[PDB]
């Protein structure tokens, strides 16, 4: 007998889609909060996965589509497509992507979730459908833009979950006391998981790599396996040197093994950057060749008795390097001697930085996936989008010239170095104007609260050409103007031109270190800045601390 959207919320909490502590759950919550929570299609996609195992492959979901209408619509459509394919819903029971994204018909989205709650697939899973037996969605268009909600995704599967299962299934150690005894439990775990790790590396080389060489070209082996044989080397040595440190009573040398191997573990950059490319190539040679497909089964049978496939095993190196800081965090907790706790604290710092190095590669690999998708959907685009930096924001806007008065309804893609003025042809987008942001600057003019009256300007440094940018709400103007400020700030960062330097956004392809903080320029895409004059490379926040140019 409660309003239908409140029933939907309760069904969503039951499907483990919404955190029970979420504001949407609370008394007094407005229907707009449910629309904001479902808008980007992430929870909706998770909802189908919670009802049906592998209804949606995580690689098909954009897990954080913050400022991208493009990524949001892809998610909503995936959710919608899976609904008729795997849940057997009719097109009449389904809503159109904009009924949710631009809250054109929110009731329809609720009806669809009700149809979904009433499907057997869900009914059987123990979950109570809804309803058991007015007009509040009309003002939704006006309220849809409101606050980044980090906590909204608490019930969403991480990208690294699949890999963490395979890792823990393998590293599974056999199963109160004092701090020293607990400290010894940590040391034992560090060695036991490392031994299994080095053997797992060995298993990949011996039962997969070497036997597959008879089936695959050296080219295919390089793509699929990368530097697994080099990782085996580093670890075979790391294992020997770590055991020596654990061999001497007291293990007050252990931390130095970690430090020495921090630079040696840089070989992971190569592994992390090519791992997904490897997986897709492995998946294709396997799908095309029945002989390779059968050999992989035999390799899996002879190595672990069908427990792990090669595809699962190749996810293990990224997981191991993420665990080092966790195994050291627990050890340092149970280390109650001032110098030894501080020595291991330095090793922990070195392993946390390696965990950040991992995550930077992952982020940049996700950014490239986004860029290549933008590229395919954008027509009349001659330029390669990867030369223009990171995507900042994308969606509909209204535009005119500085002198002109009549506004044109356009679609825009903002990246660090460029603004792409488009007009969509259904799903594809026509590039009408490619604005290079190098010569432009943002100017806001206060002169309100009328749809599309919220405007700022894009003015050229030569005063040559201009643009008046109009947005539906004051919230959308705020969102867009902040991203333009962020973009322009990345083009001309603080201290870019200091001490004779000409620091510009640069995408390093070779392993470079910051000339100021000595730390790695982490990642594979626009990692930082370069001065063409003295060839100095730095982090955005480090430009001040760089010695002068010549
Ligand atoms: C030279 C060959 S390459 O393969 O290394 N090569 C590829 C193309 C991209 C290159 C860009 C450089 C820029 O500085 N980044 C890294 N190099 C080494 C390592 N890395 C990490 C890293 C380090 C440790 C761990 C555990 C995980 C990740 C992150 N980021 C880089 C690098
Ligand atoms: Zn310089
Ligand atoms: Zn730096």
Asked if residue 277 has its Cβ within 6 Å of ligand 1, the reply is no
Atom of ligand 1 nearest to the CA of 361: 29
| 384: exposed, middle or buried (Cβ count in 10 Å: 0-12, 13-18, 19+) | exposed
Ligand 3: distance of its center to the CA of 367 in Å? 22
User: Does 148 sit in the ligand 1 pocket, CB within 6 Å?
Assistant: no
Nearest CA to ligand 1 atom 24: 266
Neighbours of ion ligand 3 (CB under 5 A): 514, 516-517, 539, 542
Say if ligand 1 is within 6 A of residue 528 CB: no
Contacts 24+ apart (CB under 8 A), 118-126: 119/87, 119/88, 119/89, 121/51, 121/52, 121/87, 122/15, 122/51, 125/51
Q: How far apart are CA 190 and CA 243, in angstroms?
A: 10
Beta carbon of 507 within 6 Å of any ligand 1 atom: no
Determine the distance separating the centroid of ligand 3 and the alpha carbon of 548, expressed in angstroms.
15
Cα-Cα end-to-end distance for the chain: 77
> Ligand 1 centre from 509 Cα, in Å?
8
For a pocket test of ligand 1, which of 235, 511, 512 has the largest count of ligand atoms closer than 8 A to its C-beta? Answer: 511
Q: Which residues, listed in sequence order, are joined to residue 68 by a DSSP beta bridge?
A: 394
Q: How many A from CA of 469 to the centre of ligand 3?
A: 36
- Residue whose CA is closest, atom 22 of ligand 1? 269
With a 6 Å cutoff on the Cβ, whether 520 touches ligand 1 is yes
Q: Does the beta carbon of 524 sit less than 6 angstroms from any atom of ligand 1?
A: yes
Distance CA 390, CA 366 (A): 11
42 neighbors 74 (Cβ within 8 angstroms): no
The closest residue, in CA terms, to atom 13 on ligand 1 is: 511
- Rounded Cα distance, 413 and 71, in Å: 12
Q: What is the Å distance from ligand 1's center to 485 Cα?
A: 29
Q: Is 389 exposed, middle or buried (0-12, 13-18, 19+ CB in 10 A)?
A: buried
Instruction: Give residue 128 CA to ligand 1 midpoint distance, Å.
Output: 50
> Is the minimum distance from the CB of 508 to ligand 1 under 6 angstroms?
yes
Q: Whose CA is nearest to atom 4 of ligand 1?
A: 270
Neighbours of 18 (CB within 10 A): 26
What span, in angstroms and rounded, lies between the C-alpha atoms of 82 and 58? Answer: 13
CA distances from 358 to 276, 330, 393, 517 (A): 13, 21, 25, 19
Give the CA-trace dihedral at 96, 97, 103, 107, to 10 degrees.
40
Residue nearest to atom 19 of ligand 1 (CA): 269
Three-state secondary structure call for residue 437: coil
Say if strands 440-444 and 418-425 run parallel, antiparallel, or are unpaired.
unpaired
Query: In which residue are the tokens 């190595």 written?
Result: 303
DSSP string, 10-44: HHHHHTT-S-TTSTTTSTT--HHHHHHHHTTSHHH
Ligand 1 within 6 A of CB of 271: no
Rounded Cα distance, 113 and 27, in Å:
21
DSSP state of 209: I
Atom of ligand 1 nearest to the CA of 523: 30
Report the alpha-carbon distance of residue 198 to residue 202 in Å, rounded: 6
Residue 273 and residue 226: Cα distance in Å, rounded? Answer: 10
- Spacing, Cα 501 to ligand 1 middle (Å): 25
Can you give the C-alpha Rg of the chain in angstroms?
27
Tell me if 321 CB under 6 Å of ligand 1. yes
The resolution of the experimental structure, rounded to one decimal in Å, is 2.6
Q: Is the CB of 521 under 6 A from ligand 1?
A: yes
Q: Is 358 near ligand 1, meaning CB less than 6 Å away?
A: yes
Residues 6+ apart with CB under 8 A from 166: 308, 312, 313, 315, 316, 319
Beta-bridge partners for 471: 454
Contact present, 116 and 87 (Cβ < 8 Å): yes
What is the per-residue DSSP string for 340-375?
Answer: HHHHHHHHHHHHHHHHHHHHHHHHHHHHHHHHHHHH
Look-up of token digits 């053997």: 199
Query: Could you give the domains of the chain?
Result: 1-157 (1.10.418.10), 158-380 (1.20.900.10), 381-494 (2.30.29.30), 495-546 (3.30.60.20)
Residues 6+ apart with CB under 8 A from 414: 391, 392, 393, 394, 420, 480, 483, 484, 487
Q: Report which secondary-structure segment, H or E, holds 391.
A: strand 391-400
Closest C-alpha to ligand 1, atom 12:
511
Rounded Cα distance between 401 and 32, Å, is: 35
Ligand 2 center–CA 506 separation, angstroms: 14
* Cα distance between residue 277 and residue 169, in whole Å: 24
Name the packing angle between helices 31-38 and 42-51 (round to 10°): 80
Q: Rounded to whole angstroms, what are the CA distances from 415 to 468, 473, 484, 486?
A: 18, 22, 9, 10
- How many CB atoms within 10 Å of residue 233? 14
Whole-number Å distance, alpha carbon 414 to ligand 1 midpoint, is 27
- Ligand 3 centroid – CA 533 distance (Å): 18
- What is the 59 CA–ligand 1 centroid distance (Å)? 23
C-alpha of residue 511 to centroid of ligand 3, in Å:
14
Q: Of the ligands numbered here, which is closest to the C-alpha atom of 538?
A: 3
CB 265 near ligand 1, within 6 Å: yes
Q: What is the b/e burial string over 117-129, where b = at least 16 CB atoms within 10 angstroms of the residue's CB?
A: bebeebeeeebee
User: Determination method here?
Assistant: X-ray
Interacting residues of 374 by C-beta distance below 8 A, sequence separation 6+:
70, 385, 391, 394, 413
Q: Ligand 1, residue 522: give the atom nearest the CA.
A: 30
């Amino acid at each position: 007998g409660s309003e239908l959207w409140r029933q939907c919320t309760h069904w969503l909490i039951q499907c483990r889609v919404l955190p029970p502590s979420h504001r949407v759950t609370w008394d007094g919550a407005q229907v707009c909060e449910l629309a904001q929570a479902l808008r980007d299609g992430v929870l909706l996609c998770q909802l189908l996965n919670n009802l049906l195992p592998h209804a949606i492959n995580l690689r098909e979901v954009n897990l954080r589509p913050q400022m991208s209408q493009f990524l949001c619509l892809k998610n909503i459509r995936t959710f919608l497509s899976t609904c008729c394919e795997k849940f057997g819903l009719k097109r009449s029971e389904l809503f159109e992507a904009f009924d949710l994204f631009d809250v054109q018909d929110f009731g329809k989205v609720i009806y669809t979730l009700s149809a979904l709650s009433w499907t057997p697939i869900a009914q059987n899973r123990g979950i109570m459908p809804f309803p058991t037996e007015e007009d509040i969605y009309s003002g939704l268009s006006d309220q849809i833009d409101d606050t980044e909600d980090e906590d909204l995704y608490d019930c969403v599967e991480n990208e690294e979950a699949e890999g963490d299962e395979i890792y823990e299934d393998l590293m599974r150690s056999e199963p109160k006391m004092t701090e020293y005894d607990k400290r010894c439990c940590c040391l034992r775990e560090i060695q036991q998981t490392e031994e299994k790790y080095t053997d797992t590396l060995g298993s990949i080389q011996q039962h997969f790599l070497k036997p597959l060489q008879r089936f695959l070209k050296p080219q295919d082996i390089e793509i699929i396996f990368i530097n697994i044989e080099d990782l085996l080397r580093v670890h075979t040595h790391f294992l020997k040197e770590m055991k020596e440190a654990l061999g001497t009573p007291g293990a007050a040398n252990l931390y130095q093994v970690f430090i020495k191997y921090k630079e040696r573990f840089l070989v992971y950059g190569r592994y992390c950057s090519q791992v997904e490319s490897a997986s897709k190539h492995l998946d294709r040679v396997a799908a095309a060749r029945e002989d390779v497909q059968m050999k992989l089964e035999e390799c899996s049978q002879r190595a672990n008795n069908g427990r792990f496939t090669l595809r699962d095993l190749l996810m293990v190196p990224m997981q191991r390097v993420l665990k080092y800081h966790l195994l050291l965090q627990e050890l340092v907790k149970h280390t109650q001697e001032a110098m030894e706790k501080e020595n291991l604290r330095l090793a922990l710092d070195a392993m946390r930085d390696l965990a950040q190095c991992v995550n930077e590669v992952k982020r940049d690999n996700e950014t490239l996936r986004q860029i290549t998708n933008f590229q395919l959907s954008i027509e009349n685009l001659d330029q390669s989008l990867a030369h223009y930096g990171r995507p900042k924001i994308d969606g509909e806007l209204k535009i005119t010239s500085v002198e002109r008065r009549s506004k044109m309804d356009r679609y825009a893609f903002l990246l660090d170095k460029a603004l792409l003025i488009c007009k969509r042809r259904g799903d594809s987008y026509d590039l009408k104007d490619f604005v290079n942001l190098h010569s432009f600057q943002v100017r806001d003019d206060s002169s309100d609260n009328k749809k599309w009256s919220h405007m700022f300007l894009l003015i050229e440094d030569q005063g040559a050409q201009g643009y008046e940018l109009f947005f539906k709400t004051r919230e959308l103007k705020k969102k867009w103007m902040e991203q333009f400020e962020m973009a322009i700030s990345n083009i001309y960062p603080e201290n870019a031109t200091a001490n004779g330097h000409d620091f510009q956004m640069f995408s390093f392809e070779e392993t470079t270190s910051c000339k100021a903080c000595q730390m790695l320029l982490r990642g594979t895409f626009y990692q930082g800045y370069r001065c063409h004059r003295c060839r100095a490379s730095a982090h955005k926040e480090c430009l001040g601390r760089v010695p002068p140019c010549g």
